Design a protein around this ligand. Structure first.
Ligand code: HEM
Ligand code: HEM
Lengths: 361, 362
């Protein structure tokens, strides 16, 4: 029911993927380094209470009547729900507090990509908090209360709700389907693969930025799907687009979902064939994204898609080469990237005396 | 995880236990052909029979002819029914079409303007609605998406709302959820097992004046923004005074347990519970079935949170209208604003595998 908050790494990267997501990006409003470090300590203490299922501060009630409650209360009665809280620092953070020379070279600005249509209001951010849990209300309460505590030092720049499987009704041994109806996550780095995480996900000391050892680099892309167009495509177009069949998720010519793919049998611009590490010099990503449906836009269309999150040891050798290879992806007909951000995700909170960001400040 | 039976004298999704997630869609009709619209209603009912049992619509999600689009969009394959219910309603604007003018129920009342209303006309009204409730949100969206797909060219989605979590209860034996203000919401509601209160306050009766509505209900939807920044800097006493119940237990002021009966004269004169209580409104009683929502930021550095309020009642004129009129002085008004609104007549249930939605109207 709970996931331990402390560790060499932050939880919520290699740990079991929870049902729900509330992702929030913050901009910093203070110039005062001390004030920000104070806020980071306060957030860490709150993160400890939240991930264990307790209220923030002195609780949601029973305090002084003429004081506002420390905790806004909407998670009273709920369980920890495998809540994890992962914080990241955006490139723009390093223009403040005199940190410019501490920006990791692996925290690269993303190039412009063919077909990008990025909404500036839902891109970027000085820092982020990824809140995952099986109960969406536990996740929202976490973000809500962190924002309330940071008020006057940070504001919320943009926020994204997402969902994956519903674990109570779905087996953990079952690959979830994205909103295009294809199994999603078959060939991925799993949290059990310690040496693949070491090779592809975690920052190493030798990498050139010592404060980031044990950390990772995060790319977030808000990816709209053109649902109504996709759904008018023939079953064979859809399967041609990915290089797997829809029902079982097996590579073309093979029988089972987990049969290793034969890339020659796929069309040259099939998504799997272009995304595969063999087509990208070995480049390999940990994908940990979530589906979203935000409503319907002004033309009656379903505002829905994939909130794509990738973790990698170096953005220059993970997301960027692979996304570049998707220039000609047949999937591009049906999707559009409309938001984007990158973050340095620092190492974990080692113990009760540690705090978010301690190796950097 | 189990299914909720689709056939009945009433539509499910009303007195049914309240499921975790909501996808509510209002549709406008774009066809003039009454026969085309009846065909749609029959086809939608057939899809609903599959969807609420966990089956793909039509001939399934794959295995069909490679050159044709699949019947079911496929993203619910391998999922359980997840207590999905689908509830359909007819907006008053619909009765201007297909020569239904004289069949509009009297109890399908237009709502008056209320003080504080700031209603967005784009997120309001609608010829008809479909309330999809389920414990899995992928199941809920898949149902809306596939219903909208089947109606292409005869209906279009006007506006929709997702509720990520429930703020209502029809099962007083289970924990009462909390809304985003942190208070338990649903303690004194009507329970799915209280048959007499449902007949009395929720289900339309033959004698009420619209025979085709017998066994149906009437639905009021209000999209309500919450000023969480204002709320979150109010003291605990201020918060508890606004409602009349304490925040921790949810007990009426002065009492010890959530379910002790409120003693109204101990609440402030403008406390929300005092003004909404049936005893203050000549006995008027509602079935509340709403959900919380949050749709991003407000572009001013804050989270955008609200409550999608849904009430079922036997007659809007004797349900939502008097209670909301009595809320004109509610202390809660300082913290909320109504920003969308719609009413629908909800027809009786689909009786059997030969019946269909709206059959008693058409
Ligand atoms: C709407 C957007 C996207 C959808 C619907 C989608 C869908 C899929 C599907 C169905 C698979 C096959 C099953 C699996 O192995 O997970 C897959 C594989 C993969 N995708 Fe995507 N994808 C999207 C965007 C992206 C992006 C932006 C990237 C990277 C820049 C990416 C990288 C990959 C990788 C690395 C694999 C594993 C390929 C392999 O080794 O077999 N995908 N994706
Ligand atoms: C954001 C808006 C609202 C919030 C946060 C809210 C919250 C609450 C709370 C905390 C309670 C006490 C617990 C309970 O018995 O459910 C309650 C009760 C109630 N509310 Fe509201 N409410 C809202 C809007 C409305 C509206 C618009 C109406 C009617 C038009 C309404 C009608 C009622 C009724 C009838 C009760 C039951 C009172 C009783 O019989 O004891 N509420 N509400």
């Amino acid at each position: 029911s709970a996931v331990p908050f402390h560790g060499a790494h932050q939880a919520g990267i290699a740990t079991p993927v929870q049902d729900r997501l509330h992702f929030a990006a913050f901009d910093v409003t203070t110039e005062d380094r001390a004030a920000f470090v104070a806020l980071l300590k306060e957030w860490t203490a709150a993160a400890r209470r939240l991930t264990a299922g307790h209220a923030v501060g002195e609780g949601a009630y029973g305090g002084l009547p003429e004081a506002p409650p420390d905790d806004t209360g909407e998670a009273l009665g709920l369980k920890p729900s495998r809540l994890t809280l992962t914080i990241g620092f955006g490139p723009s953070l390093f223009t403040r507090f005199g940190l410019a020379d501490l920006r990791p070279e692996a925290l690269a600005d993303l190039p412009k990509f063919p077909g990008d249509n990025l909404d500036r209001a839902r891109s970027g951010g000085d820092l982020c908090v990824q809140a995952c849990a099986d109960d969406p209300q536990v996740a929202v309460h976490a973000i809500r209360n962190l924002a309330r505590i940071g008020f006057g030092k940070v504001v919320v720049r943009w926020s994204q709700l997402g969902f994956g499987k519903t674990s109570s009704t779905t087996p953990d041994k079952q690959t979830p389907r994205n909103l295009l109806g294809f199994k999603d996550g078959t060939r991925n780095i799993a949290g059990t693969e310690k040496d693949r995480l070491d090779r592809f996900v975690w920052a190493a000391e030798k990498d050139g930025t010592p404060w980031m050892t044990g950390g990772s680099y995060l790319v977030a892309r808000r990816i709209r799907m053109h649902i109504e167009t996709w759904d008018r495509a023939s079953l064979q177009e859809q399967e041609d687009v990915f290089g797997r069949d829809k029902g079982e998720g097996a590579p073309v010519g093979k029988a089972k979902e987990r049969d290793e793919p034969f890339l020659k049998a796929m069309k040259p611009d099939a998504h799997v064939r272009l995304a595969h590490p063999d087509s990208n010099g070995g480049a390999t990503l940990l994908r940990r994204g979530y589906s979203f449906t935000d409503g319907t836009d002004g033309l009656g269309r379903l505002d829905a898609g994939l909130f794509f999150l990738a973790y990698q040891r170096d953005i220059r050798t993970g997301f960027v080469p692979v996304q570049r290879n998707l220039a000609t992806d047949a999937l591009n007909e049906y999707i559009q990237h409309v938001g984007s951000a990158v973050f340095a995700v620092p190492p974990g909170v080692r113990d009760a005396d540690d705090w978010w960001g301690s190796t950097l400040f």
